[PDB]
Amino acid sequence: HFNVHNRSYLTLIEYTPRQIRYLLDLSRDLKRAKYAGTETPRLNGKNIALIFEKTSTRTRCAFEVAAHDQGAHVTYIDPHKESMKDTARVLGRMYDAIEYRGFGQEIVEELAKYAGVPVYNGLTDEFHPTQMLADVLTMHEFSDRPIHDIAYCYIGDAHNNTGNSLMIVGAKLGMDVRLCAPRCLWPHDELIEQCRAIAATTGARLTLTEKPEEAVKGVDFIYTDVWVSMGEPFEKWGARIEELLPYRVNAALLAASGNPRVKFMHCLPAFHDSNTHVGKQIADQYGLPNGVEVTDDVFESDASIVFEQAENRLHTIKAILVATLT
């Protein structure tokens, strides 16, 4: 099944459609067991080491609950007196797996040669293949349609990791993907052509446009994300709000889909109000009190499934832990 040697530190473009479907089915079964009270711990006695230099909460917390539900412990190693090559080989003889948050694909790949145990690259991080597994699992649950018939549109800053990953996964699974943003914020052309080649073999419909009205007509799901990602200078906001104001998700855009059942999605955190210190500061400076990338009315509406989407990250992380540690 999911039998590749580098399966634990695979990047998203490397997943075959068969492997993705296998992990999605695994996530469905694990989620059913937890809801039904009949979960079977197959990681009893396992120990997982977690090494980081910068931290996360929403996705590091999903990881903890996934591990404990399956009977594993997590040990936190905090952030330079020993080479990472040496430390990985010491930890690989006491622990059953090592998670690296904040190091990048290249370092993790080298350490995988020497650890002797499965090594993950950011399983607890916001950018990881399991987030896309979680989003597609959410889309299948709410649409009740075959995955290759599902249509969705990502709108906003489409060249960040959320835009690139949504384009990739939709192409891999033969879905109807639309990315809507200013041309200067589209994914890199090299990546676009890579996903066009993928789409030809899977039947995927891939559209990139600057027109929100065209991008959302017929979609089951509308997906957005903060216009400035964590780390970029604040000074970038003023420019980005100028580019991306026409690309806000508001009630009118959902109606432009023509679909009464359309749902809204967001990988979170989201500036949908001024109850955040950063969000309020933007609300005062640029006159956006009702939300930046999505209005509070849409965020709190029954069309919003952001918190079901967040929950499904628990089950897909759990699926990776089961797939790679048993």
Query: Measured from the CB of residue 280, what is the shortest distance to its own copies in angstroms?
Result: 10
Nearer to its own copies by Cβ, of 11 and 87: the residue is 87
C-beta separation of 282 from 239 below 8 A: no
Instruction: Establish if 3 lies at the interface with its own copies (CB under 8 A).
Output: yes
Q: What is the amino acid identity at position 100?
A: Y
- Interface residue with its own copies among 111, 123, 147, 151 (CB under 8 A) is 147
Region of residue 61 (left: phi > 0; alpha: psi -120 to 50; beta: else): alpha
Q: Is 267 a catalytic residue?
A: yes
Q: Decide the pairing of beta strands 176-180 and 151-155.
A: parallel
User: Under the criterion CB under 8 A, does residue 54 sit at the interface with its own copies?
Assistant: no
**Residue 250 contact among its own copies, Cl ion, none, beta carbon within 5 to 8 Å by kind:** Cl ion
Instruction: Report how far residue 234's alpha carbon sits from residue 279's, in angstroms, rounded to the nearest whole number.
Output: 12
The Cα-based distances of 263 to 159, 169, 226, 245, 269 in angstroms read 22, 19, 18, 21, 18
Asked if 98 and 117 count as a contact pair (C-beta separation under 8 A), the reply is: yes
Cα separation, 27 vs 133, whole angstroms:
9
Name, in order, each residue with C-beta under 8 angstroms of 256's C-beta and a sequence gap of 6 or more.
212, 213, 216, 217
Is 180 one of the annotated active-site residues of the chain? no
Is residue 188 part of the annotated active site? The answer reads no
Looking at residues 196 to 215 of the shown chain, list those that interact with its own copies (rule: CB under 8 A): 200-203
Which residue sits closest to Cl ion, CB atoms considered? 18
The one catalytic residue among 69, 267, 272, 309: 267
| 58 annotated to bind ligand | yes
83 binds its own copies (CB under 8 A): yes
Q: Which of residues 98-127 bind its own copies (CB under 8 A)?
A: 116
| Strand, helix or coil for residue 199 | helix
59 is an annotated ligand-binding site residue: yes
- Minimum Å gap between C-beta 307 and its own copies is 5
Query: What stretch of H or E contains 204?
Result: none
Question: Which residues 281-320 are close enough to bind its own copies by CB under 8 A?
Answer: 302, 307-308, 310-311, 314
Smallest gap from residue 238 Cβ to Cl ion (A): 20
Query: In the numeric block, which tokens belong to residue 143?
Result: 């649409």
Smallest gap from Cβ 210 to its own copies, in A, equals 28
Q: Which of 135, 157, 225, 273 is catalytic?
A: 225
Q: Which residue ranges make up the site for Cl ion (CB under 5 A)?
A: 16-18, 250, 302
Q: Which does 91 bind (CB under 5 to 8 A by kind): Cl ion, its own copies, none?
A: its own copies
Residue 325, both tokens: 């540690």
Q: How far is the CB of 122 from Cl ion (least distance, A)?
A: 24
Question: Which strands sit side by side in the sheet containing 176-180, from one edge to the other?
Answer: 205-209, 176-180, 151-155, 221-224, 263-266
Does 44 contact its own copies by CB under 8 A?
no
Asked whether residue 182 is marked as a ligand-binding residue, the answer is: no
CA dist 181 → 23, 211, 319 (Å):
31, 8, 33
178 neighbors 172 (Cβ within 8 angstroms) = no
Active-site annotation holds for 225: yes
Binding residues for L-ornithine: 161, 225, 229-230
Binding residues for carbamoyl phosphate: 56-59, 101, 128-131, 267-268, 313
Q: Which residues are catalytic?
A: 101, 128, 131, 225, 267, 313
Binding residues: 56-59, 101, 128-131, 161, 225, 229-230, 267-268, 313
